[PDB]
Amino acid sequence: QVQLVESGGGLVQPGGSLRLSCAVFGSTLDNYSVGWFRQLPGKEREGLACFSRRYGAPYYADSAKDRFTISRDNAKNTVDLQLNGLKPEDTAVYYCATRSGPYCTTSVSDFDDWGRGTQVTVS
Amino acid sequence: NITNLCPFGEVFNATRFASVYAWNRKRISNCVADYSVLYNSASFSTFKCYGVSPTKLNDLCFTNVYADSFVIRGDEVRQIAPGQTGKIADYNYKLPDDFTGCVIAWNSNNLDSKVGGNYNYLYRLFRKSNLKPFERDISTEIYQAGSTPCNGVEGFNCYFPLQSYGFQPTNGVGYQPYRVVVLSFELLHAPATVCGPK
Ligand SMILES: *[C@@H]1O[C@H](CO)[C@@H](O)[C@H](O)[C@H]1NC(C)=O
């Protein structure tokens, strides 16, 4: 039932910022946590950041230091990932994922619902 | 069934531990945990539970267990509890008011302090706002303490936000390193995966 939609991907120029949003449809509970992952060409998925909806709490992985922000827009009701200084090396599939309860992690195997992923390509 | 022995050794006997601002978390699941054996596996200076009695843990089943670990100074262990305030609870690691779990700590002077000072363990000293519960902030943006904007450069009133503990062996115990492990016991409407021996 739960379906996840990523919004904001595609073709971007180096230097600008990227805003991806994650929209969650059909959740059976409101107490869940939203993770953002990327998958670079020829590598494993890696977690960037997670947001605990109950505690309103961002959780950053070591890899997301100083460029990524994760937040919630209570108007759009999305969990948003902002990447600030786009480089070509940022080119990847970005996914959002959910898990039940308020405990964030940035580990792939702790999440059970995924979006389809969205291609971000930096010019 | 679940049949693996919960891997507490992985977290309790890690030879390196995180700086508190960069606290680690491991989800534990799908395993059998013996919390009495754990308690008598070493000598903890602190073993304090919230929302559960320590004497019952082996009778309960949880959906998941999470283990957050890090090093702080002795005097700050009191800050790892719901409802506390101070530099650690405010800027580095914050428990929620509804926390359910155990806080476990022990004095790690023999391991974590170095003659003329271990400077590798850090804490966040300056921040524009207090953490939300279980927030993990690893940024290193220069903090503006005065009227003058920092432009990302250490300067007068512009401070690198992390300070090194510098643990030395001859410190008073207040100012000796403690290892900490916080075990959160989660219950969701879903099949239990972490049980006691019975
Ligand atoms: C590792 O931790 C376990 C408890 O989790 C303890 O029994 C064991 O003795 C520890 N390490 C050593 C040095 O054996």
Side-chain angles (χ1 to χ4, degrees), chain A residues 2-75 77-123, chain B residues 1-113 115-197:
Chain A
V2 54
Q3 292 167 39
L4 271 50
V5 168
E6 297 107 353
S7 171
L11 280 147
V12 294
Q13 296 234 219
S17 46
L18 176 75
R19 193 170 194 63
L20 303 184
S21 302
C22 182
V24 185
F25 301 83
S27 197
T28 79
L29 39 55
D30 184 66
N31 182 198
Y32 62 88
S33 300
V34 181
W36 273 103
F37 295 72
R38 72 178 175 212
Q39 187 156 12
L40 303 191
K43 330 285 161 168
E44 307 317 353
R45 299 265 257 264
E46 44 158 342
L48 296 177
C50 175
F51 193 83
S52 171
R53 293 165 57 76
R54 191 183 177 109
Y55 296 132
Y59 178 100
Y60 295 97
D62 302 339
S63 64
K65 188 183 150 166
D66 302 306
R67 304 165 77 219
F68 295 88
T69 312
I70 191 164
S71 65
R72 188 163 173 206
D73 174 353
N74 290 310
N77 190 33
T78 52
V79 167
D80 295 345
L81 186 72
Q82 180 98 52
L83 173 48
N84 246 36
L86 287 165
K87 295 144 195 186
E89 306 66 43
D90 294 311
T91 290
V93 183
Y94 288 73
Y95 303 78
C96 79
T98 56
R99 64 195 310 281
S100 305
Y103 281 90
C104 273
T105 85
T106 47
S107 180
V108 172
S109 71
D110 293 337
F111 297 73
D112 291 336
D113 298 296
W114 295 81
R116 96 175 267 110
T118 180
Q119 184 59 238
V120 177
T121 305
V122 192
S123 171
Chain B
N1 307 37
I2 74 171
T3 59
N4 290 342
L5 302 157
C6 295
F8 290 127
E10 207 144 302
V11 316
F12 280 78
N13 289 327
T15 17
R16 306 197 186 194
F17 260 58
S19 272
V20 65
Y21 85 92
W23 52 268
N24 284 137
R25 174 160 279 173
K26 182 162 174 57
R27 174 187 171 233
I28 290 178
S29 73
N30 288 290
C31 62
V32 184
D34 181 355
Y35 301 97
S36 93
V37 150
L38 171 61
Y39 168 74
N40 292 314
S41 85
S43 38
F44 296 122
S45 50
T46 287
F47 199 115
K48 168 54 148 122
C49 290
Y50 302 81
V52 298
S53 178
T55 85
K56 307 296 174 189
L57 294 183
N58 284 7
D59 309 341
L60 299 187
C61 285
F62 303 123
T63 310
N64 295 286
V65 175
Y66 303 86
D68 303 335
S69 54
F70 49 78
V71 161
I72 54 181
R73 282 164 44 203
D75 270 355
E76 301 178 319
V77 175
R78 76 201 58 178
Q79 285 186 39
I80 313 307
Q84 293 312 293
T85 172
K87 291 300 173 157
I88 300 309
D90 297 344
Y91 294 162
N92 290 260
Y93 181 93
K94 178 69 171 159
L95 283 188
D97 298 347
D98 63 356
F99 176 65
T100 297
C102 292
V103 173
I104 305 157
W106 68 99
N107 176 312
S108 47
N109 198 39
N110 290 293
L111 261 190
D112 285 322
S113 77
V115 298
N118 189 4
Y119 292 111
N120 288 318
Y121 289 105
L122 306 175
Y123 63 99
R124 190 178 306 282
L125 172 60
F126 299 102
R127 204 178 190 260
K128 278 176 75 157
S129 76
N130 293 345
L131 289 189
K132 299 297 189 160
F134 298 140
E135 184 167 358
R136 190 183 188 251
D137 175 359
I138 52 179
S139 47
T140 56
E141 181 155 288
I142 303 306
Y143 178 84
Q144 191 193 318
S147 26
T148 180
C150 291
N151 285 312
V153 160
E154 311 171 26
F156 193 47
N157 284 331
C158 281
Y159 304 121
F160 196 74
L162 310 184
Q163 167 91 74
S164 165
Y165 283 105
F167 287 114
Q168 301 152 84
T170 49
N171 282 3
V173 282
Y175 279 99
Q176 287 173 21
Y178 279 66
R179 285 173 188 219
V180 184
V181 174
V182 175
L183 297 185
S184 291
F185 303 135
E186 173 175 73
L187 276 184
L188 295 173
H189 296 76
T193 76
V194 181
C195 289

